[PDB]
Amino acid sequence: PSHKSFRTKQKLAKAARQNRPIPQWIRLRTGNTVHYNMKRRHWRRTKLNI
Amino acid sequence: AQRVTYRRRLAYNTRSNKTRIIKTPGNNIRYLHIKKLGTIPRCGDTGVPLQGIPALRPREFARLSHNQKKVQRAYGGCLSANAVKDRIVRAFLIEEQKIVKQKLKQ
Amino acid sequence: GRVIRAQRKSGGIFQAHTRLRKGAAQLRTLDFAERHGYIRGVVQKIIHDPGRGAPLAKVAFRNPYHYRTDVETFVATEGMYTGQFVYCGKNAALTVGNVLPVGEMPEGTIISNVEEKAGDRGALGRSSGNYVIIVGHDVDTGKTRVKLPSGAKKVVPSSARGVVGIVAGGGRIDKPLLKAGRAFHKYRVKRNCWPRTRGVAMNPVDHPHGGGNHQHVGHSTTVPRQSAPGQKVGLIAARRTGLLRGAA
Amino acid sequence: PRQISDIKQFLEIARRKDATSARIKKNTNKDVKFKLRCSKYLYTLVVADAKKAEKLRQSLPPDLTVTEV
């Protein structure tokens, strides 16, 4: 609410960083099945719950 | 007409959210947040405000010089002139009667 | 069943509202000055205590041991005024507003804020318009017989202190409240005890009086004194019931 | 901002340590304002006559940096 604690802001920074696309060269590794995942979080679909 | 908004994140009409409408040198009507009015010190014996002392917030008195917070008289800045006069007369009369009672007790 | 309202009044939301109250109305600590001579204080304030009908008196005394002044909270006696000099001690004069031992006062005097024991700082006759009458004395094993506002006769040691006069506030209960609003405002600054729901208007789970196709108790409202909590409702250990057609 | 009434005090303030600079302002009504920028305050002196303004400018200390607006 524009009035956030330091811990809350760091958690928001971590959440925004986690919600990023996975590079293709990562999926290209031999024997890897990291191509797609459902961990993508949108600000309107799934809430962070603090 | 121009409509104004609070200059701070406090969005309620509290006693700490006193505002005054001002007109700037840009033809802009906007709020100006102001503090509460000061209070004149009161007499310790009668409770009346003390003459010759400005009305200021409690910490605003620290910036004043000594003479501006005091009246040049005994108990000046703590008691009114009438209260001081009554105390002087009462003290003198009671001491005189105490002397009379002591002398007459023999 | 269910825990009744009387059992639920053990605290919490049923505590007294004491934010606006100014302090306890204790007389003073029984010290050397009051035990042997007298001490002079000046009534500097007569104020209103929220939740109390009688006014309170702020009286400033002089500390006999340290360079200091002590402010007391006497129960205001009718006729007292700010700037009055009150005297507390054994050698104090029989004047309204002074605090004297009960054994140093004649028979038939009207007093207030009377101590049950010497040093408890006032127990008897503190509500507005109430007073205690000194009935008699007994020098051997010094004890004073007094008459309480309820008509009871109590024997106290002849060293308990009392204030000469009557508690200020006059007759307050003579005026009808005249509406629930006045009753609401009266008990708002006292506690959470108003309004009151009748037991017969409840369900059997809530109160012993609840239930039935008609609002009725169904059993004698007079309950024994040795009744367990939860059933000690109605008239507890009633000696007699009905209109008090002649009593003394 | 403070205003100076007498010219003497204006020269005295100019003859100090905090007198970093001065500014000359010419108004539409042929009024001249002499402003001294000190450490805490800006001191302004108003001269309504050109002759007195010229004499004041000539009497200003040489070490003072005077700038026209």
């Binding site: - | 009668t46 | 304030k45 007569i46 104020i47 209103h48 009908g53 009688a54 006014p55 008196a57 205001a76 006696t77 009718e78 006729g79 007292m80 005024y81 700010t82 700037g83 004069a93 029989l94 004047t95 309204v96 004649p106 038939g108 005097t109 009207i110 507005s128 318009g129 007073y131 000469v164 006069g165 009557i166 200020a168 506030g169 006059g170 007759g171 307050r172 003579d174 005026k175 009808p176 005249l178 509406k179 | -």
Partner: protein
């Protein structure tokens, strides 16, 4: 104009609360809002406050009297003061 026959100050209560209760409140309200003489000043400038506080207006005798809920002095207090004075005068000798 008389403007009212019976209710007087009570007329603010309308037709509710009962006539007898309204009259009983009326008498006490008149006592509560009546002026009284200051025994130390003499002016009829004594007003009630908080049902027991009585203050005198003016530049003099700014004292506060502890009285009754609706009157400055009640009969019980007057009788108590009289008997206390009699007991004191008979015990001094």
């Amino acid at each position: 104009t008389k403007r009212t026959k019976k209710v007087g100050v009570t007329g603010k209560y309308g037709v509710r609360y009962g006539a007898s209760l309204r009259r009983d409140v009326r008498k006490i309200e008149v006592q509560q809002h009546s002026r009284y003489q200051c025994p130390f000043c003499g002016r009829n400038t004594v007003k009630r406050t908080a049902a027991g506080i009585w203050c005198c207006n003016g530049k003099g005798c700014k004292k506060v009297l502890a009285g009754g809920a609706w009157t400055v002095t009640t009969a019980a207090a007057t009788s108590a003061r009289s008997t206390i004075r009699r007991l004191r005068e008979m015990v001094e000798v």
